[PDB]
């Protein structure tokens, strides 16, 4: 019944030294029933990454909407949108449905192409921004992720170290959540290279 | 309902209106709400008439039995019996009772027992739906050690105002005077108290 927990799923993002990481599980379900193990929840518009948890129809719908809006932004501005700007766009777009909201928990991740500064942000379903320095969490295992991230995280981690930290935070949180898991993906993001890694995890 | 009990120099006076309603219909316009539980211990009843009649009847029974064994009971003792009934059966009762009596030792005493079954000893007490409208008047005009005539006027004026504003209150004003001299019943009709 609760739209934010019908399909299940989780997203987590972390900052490091001159890098950011964002990761998600691959499960899509109908409550107890597992339907897909290939439902990726992370999208990118240029070099800005967006992870979305919650109701799958709204996840799909919002991706298509922000693809729409960022493609027009780029045609008019003659440049790719930056994370700080995209974050405001997400917040604006969600609040315009204040009394009929998308049931989602979005997470922005990326590096400013000009300043080189790593950036992450989170929102509630209605657009309130959470601009944290350390990490952002979202999904049905958000409590589990908060506990893992708060204990495992330390600032100024290198890309290959940050990978291990975010992977372990996600994996162990997902293994304590019935509605998350069935595979996982981690994006490691640097100023001019992005690596994508599929994790091996228990399939129950 | 508008009921009150007031202590004064020579003892205590109970006062009440005479209206009983079933919604907006006046089922009885000459009700006697001043009820006797002992020779010189009377009570004013408010709330469910069934509940308050049942209680006062049980109290009257207890005090009659007390008297047979231990002699004349105190006003405090009577209030304790009311309380014990109102408190232990608070889930199934809707009763707001004022207890008033005269001793030669303790003189005039007034106890009020609201819904929950708590007891409060006071110089004077007011209760019933019409009491709300005279809290200010009674507080401003009450004095300790008034004369009988002063106290009768105080109750008459007070209940006159309660009747004037409360639709659930009305009819005649009944009063019972409790002194060493005995027990005096009084009555005051609309044409008397309305023009005050």
């Amino acid at each position: 019944s609760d739209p934010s927990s019908i399909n299940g799923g989780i997203v987590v993002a972390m900052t490091g030294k001159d890098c950011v990481a964002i990761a998600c599980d691959l499960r899509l379900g109908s409550q107890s029933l597992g339907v897909s193990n290939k439902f990726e929840k992370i999208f990118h518009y240029g070099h800005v990454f967006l992870g979305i948890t919650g109701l799958a129809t709204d996840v799909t719908t919002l991706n298509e909407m922000f693809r729409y809006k960022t493609n027009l932004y780029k045609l008019k501005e003659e440049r790719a949108i930056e994370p700080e700007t995209f974050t405001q766009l997400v917040s604006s777009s969600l609040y315009e449905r204040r009394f009929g909201p998308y049931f989602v928990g979005p997470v922005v991740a990326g590096i400013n192409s000009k300043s080189g500064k790593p950036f992450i942000a989170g929102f509630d379903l209605i657009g309130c921004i959470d601009e944290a320095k350390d990490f952002i969490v979202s999904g049905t295992a958000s409590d589990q992720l908060f506990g893992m991230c708060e204990s495992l995280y330390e600032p100024n981690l290198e890309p290959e170290d940050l990978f291990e930290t975010i992977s372990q935070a996600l994996l162990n949180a997902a293994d304590r959540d019935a509605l998350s898991g069935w595979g996982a993906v981690v994006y490691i993001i640097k100023k001019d290279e992005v690596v994508k890694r599929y994790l091996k995890m228990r399939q129950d | 309902t508008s009921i009150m009990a007031v202590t004064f120099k020579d003892g205590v006076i109970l006062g009440a209106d005479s209206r009983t309603t079933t919604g907006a219909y006046i089922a009885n316009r000459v009700t006697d709400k001043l009820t006797r539980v002992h020779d010189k211990i009377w009570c004013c009843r408010s709330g469910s008439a069934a509940d308050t009649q049942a209680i006062a009847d049980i109290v009257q029974y207890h005090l009659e039995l007390y008297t047979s064994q231990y002699g004349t009971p105190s006003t405090e003792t009577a209030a304790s019996v009311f309380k014990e009934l109102c408190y232990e059966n608070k889930d199934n009762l809707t009763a707001g009772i004022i207890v008033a009596g005269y001793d030669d030792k303790n003189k005039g005493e007034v106890y009020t027992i609201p819904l929950g079954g708590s007891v409060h000893k006071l110089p004077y007490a007011i209760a019933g739906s019409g009491s709300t409208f005279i809290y200010g008047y009674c507080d401003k005009n009450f004095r300790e050690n008034m004369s009988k005539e002063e106290t009768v006027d105080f109750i008459k004026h007070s209940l006159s105002q309660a009747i004037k504003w409360d639709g659930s209150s009305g009819g005649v004003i009944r009063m019972v005077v409790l002194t060493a001299a005995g027990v005096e019943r009084l009555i005051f009709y609309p044409d008397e108290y309305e023009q005050l």
Binding site: F146, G147, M148, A173, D175 | -
Partner: protein
């Protein structure tokens, strides 16, 4: 309408070593958004080298502990001062809990001690009496924050040995009391940060063959 239950917050944590056991809990007591006490002990030495904590609704938790302590007393009277083993205590507590199957003790209970072979033991319960022996367990408000961390750092879950790439797991080496206390302090420090009902103080009870020892550590008071 009268609600007979309440939530006094708090969080508890039990870890079993090879020849020891720990039972920890924060000392904060709360209702809604207010603090009742910054130091209200939650973990108790119940006798016979057994420690216990009933976390959730403090009134029910205090009643259960009080009843079990009493059960230990009567076990000595009735059975010639025989020592109540940890497995026997656990089974006894199941029956105390299920006596109220239709008006439950609203608590998550954990006990810790040593088994009859001298090895560390932790037993965990649900509010109605289902119990089982475990190596690691967090209970209470921040249980969902802490348990995954313990799966990772105590049982080395999702951890593999470098170079093999997921073919060979991390071996399950036992933990010392010094290493366990670090995980406990870090668990509660992390829970204090992200959970509003956790903080103020941390009290740890360590159980060895030598007896029951206490350690206290301050936590953030916000």
């Amino acid at each position: 309408q009268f609600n007979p239950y309440g939530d006094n917050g708090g969080t508890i944590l039990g870890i079993a070593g090879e020849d020891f056991a720990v039972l920890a809990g924060d000392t904060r007591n709360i209702t809604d958004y207010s603090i009742n006490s910054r130091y209200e002990p939650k973990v108790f030495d119940c006798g016979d080298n057994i420690v216990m904590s009933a976390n959730g609704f403090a009134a029910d938790g205090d009643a259960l502990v009080k009843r079990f302590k009493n059960s230990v007393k009567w076990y000595h009277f009735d059975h010639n001062d025989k020592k109540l083993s940890i497995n026997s205590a656990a089974r006894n507590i199941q029956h105390l809990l299920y006596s109220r199957r239709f008006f439950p003790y609203y608590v998550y209970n954990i006990i810790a001690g040593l088994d009859e072979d001298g090895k560390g033991a932790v037993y965990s319960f649900d509010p109605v009496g289902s119990y089982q022996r475990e190596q690691c367990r967090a209970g209470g408000a921040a249980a969902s924050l802490i348990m995954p961390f313990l799966d990772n750092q105590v049982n080395f879950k999702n951890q593999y040995e470098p170079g093999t790439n997921g073919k060979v797991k991390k071996p399950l080496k036992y933990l010392s009391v010094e290493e366990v206390i670090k995980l406990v302090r870090d668990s509660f420090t992390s829970a204090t940060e992200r959970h509003i009902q956790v903080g103020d103080g941390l009290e740890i009870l360590i159980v060895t063959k030598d007896g029951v020892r206490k350690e206290f550590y301050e936590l953030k008071r916000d």
